[model samples]
Target: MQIFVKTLTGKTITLEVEPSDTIENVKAKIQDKEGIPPDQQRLIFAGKQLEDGRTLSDYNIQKESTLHLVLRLRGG
Candidate 1:
């Protein structure tokens, strides 16, 4: 299935992934395009925070679904 990903930078892109794929998998793809590491990606779908171990299906995500990816910020 294909889904749209919106980054915090206001960039959007489409990624083709399986429903069985974990959110972590989606993060990796996003990393490729956004240069944000998977661990630093905070993904949200349907108004809920998406967990790394959760599959897309677990979130009831479908084709054309839009996911928001916010880069985790840290300070010293």
Candidate 2:
């Protein structure tokens, strides 16, 4: 399935994620698309850093679902 995501920088990216994909996997995809390191990524959803070790299942994400993953920078 395909998932659409918008970055904090207003860039939109499309991803082909499976039902078994994890939030970490999705984050990795975003990192790749945006040329950011996975460890350097700070993806936020609902005002919190989306847990890194949890599957999308843990967060109740639907397949082919489009998500808004915002990058929160620390410090100025």
Candidate 3:
């Protein structure tokens, strides 16, 4: 199955993953496709922050679902 995601900047991307996959895995793929590091990727779905420890199924993520991606702010 697959999922669709849109970045805060309005960049949209499609990701291929299984229901058993973790949000961290999605973040890793996002890093490759968007140049954003996994740690910097903040994923939101259903008005909730998607935690790395949770699986897609845990969050009820379905095929063709859209997740909003935001960048994690950091201070020097």
Say which candidate scores most in TM-score: 3
**lDDT accuracy of residue 22 in candidate 3:** 91
lDDT of 1 by residue, 1-76 (tens): 7899887779888998999999989999887876778877788888899888999999999998999877766621
Name the candidate that leads on lDDT: 3
| Candidate 1: Cα lDDT at 9 | 75
Sort every candidate by TM-score, greatest first: 3, 1, 2
Query: How many clashes would you count in candidate 2?
Result: 0
Instruction: Give candidate 3's TM-score.
Output: 0.89
* Every candidate's CA RMSD: 2.2, 2.7, 2.0
User: Global lDDT of each model?
Assistant: 0.86, 0.69, 0.87
| Backbone clash total, candidate 1 | 0
Q: After superposition, how far is residue 57 of candidate 3 from its true place, in Å?
A: 0.3
Model 3 agreement with the true structure over 1-76: per-residue lDDT tens digits: 9899987678789999999999988898888887887877788899898889899999999999999987876721
lDDT of 1 at 25: 90
lDDT of predicted model 1 = 0.86
Using alpha carbons, what is the TM-score of model 2? 0.67
